[PDB]
Coordinates of C-alpha atoms in Angstrom, one line a residue:
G92 CA -18.6 49.1 17.1
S93 CA -18.9 46.6 14.3
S94 CA -22.7 46.3 13.9
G95 CA -23.3 42.7 13.2
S96 CA -26.2 40.7 14.6
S97 CA -29.3 38.8 13.5
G98 CA -31.6 41.7 12.5
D99 CA -31.0 43.1 9.0
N100 CA -31.0 40.5 6.2
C101 CA -30.2 42.3 3.0
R102 CA -27.5 42.8 0.4
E103 CA -26.1 46.2 -0.8
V104 CA -25.5 46.2 -4.5
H105 CA -23.9 49.3 -6.0
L106 CA -23.9 50.0 -9.7
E107 CA -22.5 52.5 -12.2
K108 CA -24.7 54.0 -14.9
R109 CA -24.4 57.0 -17.2
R110 CA -26.0 60.4 -16.4
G111 CA -29.5 60.0 -17.7
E112 CA -29.3 56.3 -18.3
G113 CA -32.3 54.1 -17.8
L114 CA -31.7 52.0 -14.7
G115 CA -33.3 49.1 -16.5
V116 CA -35.6 47.7 -13.8
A117 CA -39.3 46.8 -13.5
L118 CA -41.0 46.6 -10.1
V119 CA -44.6 45.7 -9.3
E120 CA -47.0 45.5 -6.4
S121 CA -46.8 42.4 -4.2
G122 CA -49.3 41.1 -1.7
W123 CA -47.3 38.4 0.2
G124 CA -46.2 39.7 3.6
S125 CA -47.6 40.3 7.1
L126 CA -48.7 43.9 7.5
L127 CA -47.5 45.8 4.5
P128 CA -46.6 44.8 0.9
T129 CA -43.1 44.5 -0.6
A130 CA -41.3 45.6 -3.8
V131 CA -40.8 42.7 -6.1
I132 CA -38.9 42.9 -9.4
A133 CA -41.4 42.1 -12.1
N134 CA -38.9 42.4 -15.0
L135 CA -35.4 43.5 -15.8
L136 CA -33.7 45.0 -18.9
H137 CA -31.3 42.3 -20.0
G138 CA -28.4 44.6 -20.7
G139 CA -28.6 47.4 -18.2
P140 CA -26.6 48.8 -15.2
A141 CA -28.7 46.8 -12.8
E142 CA -28.8 43.5 -14.7
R143 CA -25.2 43.6 -15.7
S144 CA -24.6 42.9 -12.0
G145 CA -25.9 39.3 -12.4
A146 CA -27.0 39.0 -8.8
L147 CA -30.1 41.2 -9.1
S148 CA -32.7 39.0 -11.0
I149 CA -36.4 38.9 -11.4
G150 CA -38.0 38.0 -8.1
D151 CA -35.7 39.5 -5.5
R152 CA -37.5 42.0 -3.2
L153 CA -36.1 45.5 -3.1
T154 CA -35.9 47.4 0.2
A155 CA -34.3 50.8 -0.7
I156 CA -32.5 52.7 -3.4
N157 CA -29.4 54.9 -2.9
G158 CA -30.4 55.0 0.7
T159 CA -34.2 55.4 0.4
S160 CA -36.1 53.1 2.7
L161 CA -39.0 52.1 0.3
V162 CA -40.2 49.3 2.5
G163 CA -43.8 50.1 3.2
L164 CA -44.4 52.7 0.5
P165 CA -46.7 51.8 -2.5
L166 CA -45.3 50.6 -5.8
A167 CA -45.9 54.1 -7.2
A168 CA -43.4 55.6 -4.8
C169 CA -40.8 53.0 -5.8
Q170 CA -41.6 53.7 -9.4
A171 CA -41.1 57.4 -8.9
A172 CA -37.9 57.0 -6.9
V173 CA -36.3 54.3 -9.1
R174 CA -36.7 56.8 -12.0
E175 CA -34.7 59.6 -10.3
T176 CA -31.6 57.4 -10.4
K177 CA -31.8 57.7 -14.2
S178 CA -30.1 61.1 -13.9
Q179 CA -27.7 59.7 -11.3
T180 CA -24.6 57.8 -12.4
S181 CA -24.9 55.4 -9.4
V182 CA -27.5 53.0 -8.1
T183 CA -27.4 51.1 -4.8
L184 CA -30.0 48.3 -4.7
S185 CA -30.6 46.5 -1.4
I186 CA -32.6 43.2 -1.6
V187 CA -33.2 40.3 0.8
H188 CA -30.5 37.6 1.1
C189 CA -32.3 34.6 2.5
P190 CA -30.4 31.3 3.0
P191 CA -31.1 28.3 0.7
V192 CA -33.6 26.2 2.8

């Protein structure tokens, strides 16, 4: 049925880049958390396929890319996976969508 319940709090953001086009994203290693670290956007290329979106901005925490659960993996992994997209003409970024306290 229509899967919809308090469990997964994220936002799927698909993009359209050119074959071999730099995604235009900069992630780093974060400590904040409970058991494992998270992927936090350190910097973004003001003028890329990811930024052009407007929603994805420095800070947001990445969870996966094009269907690649990165949550848990070290920054290196995310840095190696985020690069692959370069060749791809599409990019699906999924970050956390927490409510405005």
